[PDB]
Assembly symmetry: C5
Homo-oligomer: 202 residues x 5
């Protein structure tokens, strides 16, 4: 198989609408935010404008191929792949995807989608101008798939990719996993809560 054959096969047979659950197990989705920039902060409105790497990982075995004498990875448009229906619960603008919308697919069926995203959020901006800084929390989870269909899990220097030219600096980033039941649905929905501790530079 060359890349042309692999991509032809994926295009003809991937079902982008079909969640790739195996044996009534959930699809395990890894989520991790790498902050690139903090562009605007409003301590009165409690709004922030940030740019982050949304590093997203999952397995889809229907994509797998024998790579014994073949490329073991290809890049694939996400329009030809199933992708998890993740959303930030406290976002107040839609995600502005800054980068080409291609995922990397490994021959064992591992998919890695890592777009750079600019988005506005409602969160706690108090303390942004102090030693301890502000802590803005961002919840991301599957919009329509409960915990028996999609599980989300944090994977893991916090400023590695953070712009040195921002007016802000990152003090710390922590992630944590949540299982929430909402009074109107019987099942639990998982999210990752990302806490960004940052402050205005001096």
């Amino acid at each position: 198989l060359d890349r042309a054959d692999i991509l032809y096969n994926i295009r003809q047979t991937s079902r982008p609408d079909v969640i790739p659950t195996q044996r009534d197990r959930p699809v395990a989705v890894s989520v991790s935010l790498k902050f690139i920039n903090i562009l605007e902060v409003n301590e009165i409105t409690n709004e922030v404008d940030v740019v982050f790497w949304q590093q997203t990982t999952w397995s889809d075995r229907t994509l797998a191929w024998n790579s014994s004498h073949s490329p073991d990875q290809v890049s694939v448009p996400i329009s030809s792949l199933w992708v998890p229906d993740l959303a930030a619960y406290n976002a107040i603008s839609k995600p502005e995807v800054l980068t080409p919308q291609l995922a990397r697919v490994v021959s064992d069926g591992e998919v890695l989608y890592m777009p750079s995203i600019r988005q506005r959020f409602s969160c706690d901006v108090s303390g942004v101008d102090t030693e301890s800084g502000a802590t803005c929390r961002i919840k991301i989870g599957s919009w329509t798939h409960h915990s028996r269909e999609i599980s989300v899990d944090p994977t893991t220097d916090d400023s590695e990719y953070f712009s040195q030219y921002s007016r802000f600096e990152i003090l710390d980033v922590t992630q944590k996993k949540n299982s929430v039941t909402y009074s109107c649905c019987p099942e639990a929905y998982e999210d990752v809560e990302v806490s960004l501790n940052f402050r205005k530079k001096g």
Copy 2:
């Protein structure tokens, strides 16, 4: 049937353009707004900028499948489904859908669609910076289907509903009420149903 078969079948036979009236009855559409945020308010122009979840429910039997030994629910892109043509009459921007545009479909044909939407409305902002607050009314109904084709009703509430509102808003919600109306417009002979959602809110002090 596995999920792949169910979604294949739906994709091949949905008929997204066809309102699923059963016999000669209206499609019963449930609608309810859960407010997530109030972002901007202007008392001189009587405009508000708001984020809400638009909880929407209806039945489409053409989607039903035998779930005896199968998944009883799947997620489906709304582009593959008939969806009610709802609109807010006093909206002054088009809905900005913040979330993935997927509905949940149950094996008995029940459809649940709930996008998170940011939108601007024209409404009564007077009193917002007082203790009794302002009362903004949002009117939602089918744009082109009269009452014999689509009926709209509020869903019954959850104890949780008041708690999706952001604690970080400059504003706080005092109360949310809903009400069903049937209006006849001068341009058209039949009645059109809407739900009016009254949002009583004020600036935090």
Copy 3:
């Protein structure tokens, strides 16, 4: 015929690019604007931001069906229909369509399309703060079809106007016009909508 059959037929024989003229007569298009709101007015720049329902009506016999024992109306996506190529000549933004883009089609072939639209126009804003108000004129006609192909005609002044606007409507009138531009031999029809409005006391 049920609705599924009607909509299948419309979709399958869908000729959205083909103007439905009958017998070498023009397609008669009705248009009227129902003003919903006036959001922003600038008397220095002579610009207004408005919300209106664009009530549009025409006949397309290729859509017709025998409704003797069938629904006599269906809702149809305008993407599956021919639609007159109307434009406001003094618009300075593209139309922002606020509603689902569905038209109502009657079994005799009549089509009724009435979207809510937000749009900005260049027009006379002088006198908006006076008692007689300003009069803003909105010119609407077919962009590319002359009078032998499309004719345009008019279809309560504030039955739908928002009570929460900073403005009030004093009067709305419509005149028809037929214009031969220096660019083309044929005449093009338009409707002129005059909106007389003022800032509330």
Copy 4:
């Protein structure tokens, strides 16, 4: 042939991606701007926001039909036609097309496309508040087709009386430019808009 047949034929055979050269002669494209409005002018940044009709004309013989007993013109979506790949070199926003994107096609293959466009340009705004006014130049040509493939040539009265500005004069010049990156000449039309603020 009725309109339905003509439009069916065009939709099936028009090759929107294929430049309609005949006998290795350039496609002759006429372009002219009719100014409708000047909305915003910035003396700080040297930017102007203007609305114009972009009157564009060319011949595509593959569209032609026998019109002896048929309509001699139809309106056609530009998505079904080859369109010259014109761009304004000093534009700083993409063209906002205000009107239905339909062209008029004549039975001999002549195409006439004239959208109303709102667009923002970088140009000389100095003098906008004097009697002599400012002169803003807009340069338009084919982005990727040189002079042996596309030639461009020139083809007040529609200007809004409600603009804060008035037009003193519009002139049009044609140029043939060779750029560093490329061996062939590219043609453009330069439109000079002499305008001023009304007092």
Copy 5:
């Protein structure tokens, strides 16, 4: 072959999703930016709004045709072609493409794509209103393809810095330099190439 045949063939067989690697070797992609305008600069936020021609060049042999008695070049919509998945790492808006999205394809398979782009970047704006000027650095590379799949060539030949630069900008260009970098990201284990373009500019002030 006439143009119609060449374009038909390209439309029928180009695999837009398939990177045109020969063997195990990378597709060499050339990238250079020609600055057209600097529209807005914010020294407090360290943000700039710029317009440039993003001259992009690569080879795709699957597009090649015998041009002995045929046109040796055609213009082709990029939607019918594989194009490299380049992104500016410090962009804070998506690219606003100002021009028709057509690439020029030569009969040997060389592709030349040169759109005019307006985009906002986060970078060092300090010194913009001084004589020595600011230096804003723009980083562009393949988003998902490592160095064995795409190499980015920043090299230049006979370029001048202000040739296409607008005389009506509030800013002037002092110098433009290009440089290649190779980085290993903590996400993955391979090297990824980028071009770093350094724009030395200042506010006009004489």
